[PDB]
Curated annotation (Swiss-Prot), chain B:
The modification Phosphoserine is found at residues 60, 75. Homodimer; may form higher-order oligomers. Interacts with TCF7L2/TCF4; the interaction is direct. Interacts with HABP4 and SERBP1. Interacts with SPINDOC; SPINDOC stabilizes SPIN1 and enhances its association with bivalent H3K4me3K9me3 mark. Interacts with SPOCD1; promoting recruitment of PIWIL4 and SPOCD1 to transposons. The gene is SPIN1. It is found in: Nucleus; Nucleus, Nucleolus. Residues 83-144 are annotated as: Tudor-like domain 2. Residues 44-49, 93, 191-193 are annotated as: Histone H3K4me3 and H3R8me2a binding. One of its GO terms (molecular function) is methylated histone binding. This is Spindlin-1. The 3 tudor-like domains (also named Spin/Ssty repeats) specifically recognize and bind methylated histones. H3K4me3 and H3R8me2a are recognized by tudor-like domains 2 and 1, respectively. One of its GO terms (cellular component) is nuclear membrane. It comes from the Eukaryota. Residues 154-201 are annotated as: Tudor-like domain 3. Residues 4-67 are annotated as: Tudor-like domain 1. GO terms for biological process: gamete generation; meiotic cell cycle; positive regulation of DNA-templated transcription; positive regulation of Wnt signaling pathway; protein localization to chromatin; regulation of DNA-templated transcription; rRNA transcription; transposable element silencing by piRNA-mediated DNA methylation.
Length: 172, 201
């Protein structure tokens, strides 16, 4: 596992210039071990990538190395969203998603807290199960339930086949 | 130390054993991801230059000139706003005559020089600057009709691409165009021109 490690690799999609990405691996998904969750330098969204299988990932390499809000609705500078958990590896960072963008973000939220930018206001775990959403056209969007938000167990992290973002949906 | 952003500057320019040419221009910006790098609009150059003025030895006797005066409220502001992010056909005068017409895109109002606009072309993807309202009024600027697995902001990231000969062009993404988030400014290590590319393929 690279979990907790630091990585770097190129990102190449199309015959296009390779930008160089740097980030720290925070997770290797139990229900899918070839999928890792990464926090890259300069990105606010957490990325879900099958690092060793994605052909967009070039020359990968390894590198050199609160309990209150968790679960509460929130308004912060402005956006409304919910704090989900305390990001792994990077203990200071917080998993968070927003109502107008149901994807996984990661922020040092206590630092936003002090600048006062924080206004805190039946089925068992579905992790491991494939999920399908029927979209606009009469087509199915298929994904995998990879994590359950402990603070609020009705909420799950979903990795859809067509995207590297981690979606956060309420399946209840 | 001294903030020269927005200043009029002059300096000697010397390459090799060559003579010193005197350059005069306006400092438009100091790049957040590389504070040693400045973007300058030089008198005589239509292209924006990126130079590490303090560290580059080709730059000598760097001095701030008396301040320039900017226009606070541009006329035809509606047209100026409308142009941003639009595909255009820019007519230019050629050889000893005849109009050459280039397809391009208006990226934004230039910083500091309020009547100027950042623009780039399909046939020459570097950062140019022109007082486009003048070109428009003269009939040389025509405005034309214009996410699954799409990315975040690439600013601050190193980039590289293979050239025809196999060698690699290396550089850094230094700015994201507000009106067209997939388009970025890139400073390559082998050129002082600023390249403009859509990176969200």
């Amino acid at each position: 596992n690279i979990v907790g490690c630091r990585i770097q690799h190129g990102w190449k999609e199309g015959n296009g210039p390779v930008t160089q990405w740097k980030g720290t691996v925070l997770d290797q998904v139990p229900v899918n071990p070839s999928l890792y969750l990464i926090k890259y330098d300069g990105f606010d969204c957490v990325y879900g990538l099958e690092l060793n299988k994605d052909e967009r990932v070039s020359a990968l390499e390894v590198l050199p190395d609160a309990d209150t809000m968790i679960g509460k609705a929130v308004e912060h500078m402005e956006w409304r969203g919910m704090v989900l958990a305390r990001a792994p590896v990077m203990n200071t960072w917080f998993y968070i998603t927003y109502e107008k963008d149901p994807v996984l973000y990661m922020y040092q939220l206590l630092d936003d807290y002090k600048e006062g930018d924080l206004r805190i206001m039946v089925v068992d775990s579905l992790v491991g199960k494939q999920v399908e959403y029927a979209k606009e056209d009469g087509s199915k969007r298929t994904g995998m339930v990879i994590h359950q938000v402990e603070a609020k167990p009705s909420v799950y992290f979903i990795k859809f086949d067509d995207d590297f973002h981690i979606y956060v949906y309420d399946l209840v």
